[PDB]
């Protein structure tokens, strides 16, 4: 439910948590972490450094430890690339998306 913007300034990576916000505050290219019930959605843009995605990935696991379940952490994460916004992920937000009918258009 809560995001996590972690990016490096110049040569050092910085980890910062971001309260459940909307896409409006969603920076252009940054490393965010959206932990949902089914699984955590890892959104990685094009600008996001290779290290940021790595550090921000492990830093998030720390929070997951607070969640229930036993080996729920073993579950794999759905990697996301820059330029793809599925109507499923958006549902994880508090503000519904009009693109939720992307499937209704078909059988």
Could you give a short account of the major beta sheet? 3 strands, mixed
Class computed from helices, strands and strand pairing? alpha+beta
How far the N terminus sits from the C terminus, by CA atoms, comes to 30 Å
Integer tally of domains: 1
Radius of gyration over all CA atoms, rounded: 14 Å
CATH architecture: 3-Layer(aba) Sandwich
State the assembly state of the protein chains: monomer
- What is the CATH homologous superfamily assignment? Severin
Shape, per Cα inertia axes? globular
Query: Given this structure, which CATH class is correct?
Result: Alpha Beta
- What is the H-and-E element order? EEEEHEH
Number of contiguous helices: 2
Helix content: 10-25%
Order of strands across the main sheet: 3-4-5
> Could you please say which CATH topology applies here?
Severin
Strands, total number: 5
PDB class: structural protein
Keywords: beta-core, modular protein, villin, structural protein
Assembly: monomeric
Entry title: Sixth Gelsolin-like domain of villin in 5 mM CaCl2
Put the structure in a nutshell.
The chain has helices at residues 50-64, 87-90; strands at 3-8, 13-18, 31-35, 40-44, 78-80. It has 107 residues and is of the alpha+beta class. The PDB classes it as structural protein.
Please explain how this structure is put together.
With 107 residues, this protein is of the alpha+beta class. It has a single domain, classed as Severin. It has two helices and five strands. The strands form two sheets. A three-stranded mixed beta sheet has the order 3-4-5, with helices on one face. Strands 1-2 form a two-stranded antiparallel sheet. The radius of gyration is 14 Å and the shape is globular. 15% of the residues are buried.
